Amino acid sequence: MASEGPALYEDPPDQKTSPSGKPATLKICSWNVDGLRAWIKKKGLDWVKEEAPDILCLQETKCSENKLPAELQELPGLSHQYWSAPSDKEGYSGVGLLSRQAPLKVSYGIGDEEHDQEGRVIVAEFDSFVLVTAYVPNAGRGLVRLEYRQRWDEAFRKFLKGLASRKPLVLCGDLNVAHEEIDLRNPKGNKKNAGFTPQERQGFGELLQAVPLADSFRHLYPNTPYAYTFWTYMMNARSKNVGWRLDYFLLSHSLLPALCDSKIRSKALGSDHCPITLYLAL
């Protein structure tokens, strides 16, 4: 990180109407919170209250479903709350989905035992679309988990293609890959690191192709550099904007006409990731 100084990024203003002029009717916020308790202490809920999304998706809660912070009972506009944590009941990984309205159905996991033990996926079916939030397994230090990650990628893509065959799909969360060079500050130095291996990048391309899905942010901002969602807490990385875009909203092609905007909330503190926000005119 000795070669990088600051690179400026200012997320554009919120575009809240679609290309057809329809006002957004759905606001979804996604956030890897780096520990639910830690994030709450760091005032994450105060930020959520200001953002006022219709649906909030959280990853890396690191929190047993039996040990939820009581502060989550102070979110009256997000009163339907669903959680999945590792089946061993330990405090790591973990996702949550909090919604203004109750979904038609909530499910956990991807229908594959091997991949359903670490609290990584919630599926929330609504009238006109299905929402999936995910915390994708990291490839690990020394890439020791890369083989598992490739198995996960395949199982997950097949699962999502199935869902999308029935209803339009929105996938959000920490997908643990920077797809292209534009998606991280230092592509050259990270090609052998978790999050930017050729294996992971191509797995992401495979996901877009197979389902298929569009990367909402990149669709809208195809040439925009320095837009990241994660910065290591070390090396003063966030202040220099030496980051990675690891957090996405991926959409069925049929939802593109409903796409108003896909935001990166760069200034929102409380984790080593920042929130992302999607506006749809459904």
Q: What is the DSSP letter of 92?
A: S
| Residue 174 bears catalytic tag | yes
Of the residues 34, 153, 247, 273, only one is catalytic, namely 273
Whole-number minimum distance, CB 105 to Mg ion, in Å?
30
Is 272 annotated for ligand binding?
yes
Of the residues 82, 108, 135, 248, only one is catalytic, namely 135
With H, G, I as helix, E, B as strand and everything else as coil, classify residue 82: strand
User: Which position has the token pair 């919604």?
Assistant: 99
Report the residue number, 85 or 169, with the smaller CB distance to Mg ion: 85
Q: From the centroid of its chain, how far is CA 265?
A: 13
Whole-number minimum distance, CB 119 to Mg ion, in Å?
14
Footprint of Mg ion on this chain (CB under 5 A)? 34
Is 273 annotated for ligand binding?
yes
Contact 217, 15 (CB under 8 A): no
Contact 146, 106 (CB under 8 A): no
Whole-number minimum distance, CB 156 to Mg ion, in Å?
20
Whole-number minimum distance, CB 34 to Mg ion, in Å?
4
Contact 124, 97 (CB under 8 A): yes
Of the residues 11, 153, 174, 247, only one is catalytic, namely 174
Q: Which residue is nearest to Mg ion (CB)?
A: 34
Report the residue number, 11 or 174, with the smaller CB distance to Mg ion: 174
Is 32 annotated for ligand binding?
yes
Bridge pairing between strands 259-264 and 26-32:
unpaired
Cα 233 from Cα 21, distance rounded (Å): 40
Whole-number minimum distance, CB 102 to Mg ion, in Å?
30
Contact 258, 24 (CB under 8 A): no
C-alpha to C-alpha distances, 2 to 6, 8, 58, 182, 209, nearest whole angstrom? 11, 17, 32, 19, 37
Cα 214 from Cα 170, distance rounded (Å): 10
151-178: burial string, b at 16+ Cβ within 10 Å, e else:
ebbbbbbebbeebbeeebbbbbbbbbbb
42-177-38 Cα angle (round to 5): 15
Report the residue number, 123 or 268, with the smaller CB distance to Mg ion: 268
| Residues with active-site annotation | 135, 174, 273
Report the binding-site residues for Mg(2+). 32, 60, 174, 176, 272-273
Residues at the annotated binding site?
32, 60, 174, 176, 272-273
